[PDB]
Please model this.
Amino acid sequence: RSCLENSSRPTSTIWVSMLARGAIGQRIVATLPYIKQEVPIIIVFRALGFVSD
Amino acid sequence: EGPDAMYVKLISSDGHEFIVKREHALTSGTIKAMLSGPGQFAENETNEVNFREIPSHVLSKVCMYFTYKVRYTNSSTEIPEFPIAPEIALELLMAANFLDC
Amino acid sequence: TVINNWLLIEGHTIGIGDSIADSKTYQDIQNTIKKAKQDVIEVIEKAHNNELEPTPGNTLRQTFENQVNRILNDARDKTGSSAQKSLSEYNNFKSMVVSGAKGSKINISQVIAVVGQQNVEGKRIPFGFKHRTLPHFIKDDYGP
Amino acid sequence: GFVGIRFCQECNNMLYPKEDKENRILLYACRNCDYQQEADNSCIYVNKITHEVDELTQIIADVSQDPTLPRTEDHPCQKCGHKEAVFFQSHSARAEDAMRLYYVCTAPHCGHRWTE
Amino acid sequence: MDVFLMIRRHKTTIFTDAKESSTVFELKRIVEGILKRPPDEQRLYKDDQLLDDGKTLGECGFTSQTARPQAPATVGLAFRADDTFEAL
Amino acid sequence: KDILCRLEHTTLRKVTANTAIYYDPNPQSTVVAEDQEWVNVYYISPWLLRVELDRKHMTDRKLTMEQIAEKINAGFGDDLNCIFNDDKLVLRIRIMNKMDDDVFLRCIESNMLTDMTLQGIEQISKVYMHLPQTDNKKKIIITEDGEFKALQEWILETDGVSLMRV
Amino acid sequence: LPKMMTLHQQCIRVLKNNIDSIFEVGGVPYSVLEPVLERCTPDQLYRIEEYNHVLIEETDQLWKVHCHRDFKEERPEEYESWREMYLRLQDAREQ
Amino acid sequence: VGLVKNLALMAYISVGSQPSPILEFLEEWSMENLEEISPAAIADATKIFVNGCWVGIHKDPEQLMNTLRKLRRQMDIIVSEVSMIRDIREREIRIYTDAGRICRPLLIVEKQKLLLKKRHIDQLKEREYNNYSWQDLVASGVVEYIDTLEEETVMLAMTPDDLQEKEVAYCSTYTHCEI
Ligand SMILES: [Zn+2]
Ligand SMILES: [Zn+2]
Model:
């Protein structure tokens, strides 16, 4: 529940979750604020500016 | 002090010398090397053990510890400790030099 | 009406002297508690040195918990039995228990001898800190 | 034994296992760029279902500085002979089946960790 | 069990070992055996409680505590029964 | 205990120590090299699934490796060949005859670990044997003399319900 | 304490509990005093060495046990015994 | 029941502080920023969190926590209500300055001895003569405020009788004592 210090603003909550076993493997996804669907975490890292694995 | 060796006299350059059971001074390291010197059999029975520079109460504690340790080693009891005063331990530690224990 | 008017002559009370046991009883309770704590420490040492054999149908931690709770329940039961055995015929806790009016032998045991094990959700007090019930204990303290 | 991630060098991405039937051997190939590399270990994937018997390698020596950990002087260090050592149970989810004690030497510059 | 008394004559202290009941002049006898002390020269003083004219060790002054290997109980000595009582 | 083993569900996961995936295009020269002798006794995709089973789980379930092998063969109908030996309990699985065979063997290994039954009934996770000391769950009988006699007989509990199969 | 102790061990365990009681050692060699000084903390070593100066050139290796515990990233330079290095870095860090 | 709670008598809820002095001090007390480090240095170092912000890593976390505790105990750069937690097993140092942290004052114990001496008690017996107050006791490095996250790393003696204990004290590393 991320909230910027030195300011009075609402807290933005990010959920870095992992899918259950029941699926070839279990994957890590990210539920971002103001985003309707879950996003895979590697896509978020690439959109942050790091394309290489 | 008597040549029948179950009492041995020992002096520390103080007036208050001490005479103790040889059998309860048996746990000395140096009783095997300066009463059991170059040859046994009436070297021990002289019982003039003229040590130097030890205050009286210090070696009183040391030889009372001798009786203590002899009768509390290999007996039915093994737990108990030795209650030395904190300061005298320093000079008692120099007794820790002499007796090889 | 008849019993309530005879009770004016007889009277019934509860006092702090009904919570006292004999000195011999207090010694017996302290001895039982000491022996049971020693037994719990021995079971802890057996589990720590991997000498504790799991029972069928249960894992090692739950067999340890069952053994510890068995020891402590035996402690509470024996101390309580000594507590009721100390009680005189004039004891008013005993009077209200054997009359069935109020209280039980567990209440007498907790007042006189041992309150006993505190349980939350059917287990012992959980490690709400990192592996500690309270910050006054050391980590991984499974003692009573 | 375990298998790790082997990385490409052209784009630093992940190499995926693949075979060549002309050489009939195993190679880790990058499928972002066109890089290929002959694979050293034949093991592609391994399960470790009951290979959680070890917990000593995850323990760090810094827990010798933990004041809330129990200390003993009856378990001397084998590597350096220090008399004092902290002991604790395993903190893993694999520790439900074991109350096994692990010991860490509290002497600085040693950090030796052992079991019973 | 044991006994622990520093037989203290100022600058000469005798060591003894005995049990909880022994006649108190047998202490003088075991001093006499090696230190050549006649019973005139063996006027043992009191304890903190008065000494034992009944002549046993399980009588006044001596308890189960005074047989302490941790630290004994000490008292002065005079090697003359009636004439003089020499300290130092 | 025999009935308890016949009732409790046993997947391959309960008895497997490890599963490893290898590139072994020539079974004549096994890359693992600890299975050379019995594979050469027996002697195909170049992909190998090596399954090592724990000793204790295979003993107390009273399972022998031939039963697991015929369970493989019945499960897949010779879509894939599984050889085995032990004297380490070693199985070796290949897939005889665009979704490369490594991910297909991935998938069938997931099927091994999850969706295969060795012995027991699927809905029953755990079976607790006990001998009851109370008359609530005993076998009361009427003797020849005519008394009600309580017989202590071993009874099982389950953690799932598959009543008709039981 | 279910342990037997000889005179060395008795004196050094008592003194290992009350290091703070030491003002002046008298004439004890360090080789005897080696145990109680290794279970110690550098301020007490400074106190001992500034009351019992004759021990100084004996205790320098002991300071290494402190240095690699308080300045583990460091090494001595040449012409630097461990006591003077520990005091120089300690005062430099406080400053 | 259980949802509505009450404060303990010496419980104090923290009011909040700016992280800037602690951040500056960490920047020039040998902590390297996240922007200036290769990731290979993160594996053996201690991550440093200030109000939950990962700001850098430190190579010597024990002397860093000693320095931070020394600063907070003498009411230097770090103010008294700042919580500093060293997760030793997880190699993390978390510094919290934000509001809402409930804490309580505890006597500081160094080497099985209270830092509260008879001189502090004698000075506090004449509170309205010496002008010695509770805040002077905090500034003396005698008491300090510990919150719930820091309390999970401290070792509390219930009484000073737990300190003055013989050969088996059940713990020889008490860090704090209940008042
Ligand atoms: Zn590439
Ligand atoms: Zn070590």
Observations:
- The longest helix of chain C spans residues 60-86.
- The pocket of zinc ion (ligand 2) is lined by residues D 77, 79-80, 82, 105, 107, 110, 112 (CB under 6 Å).
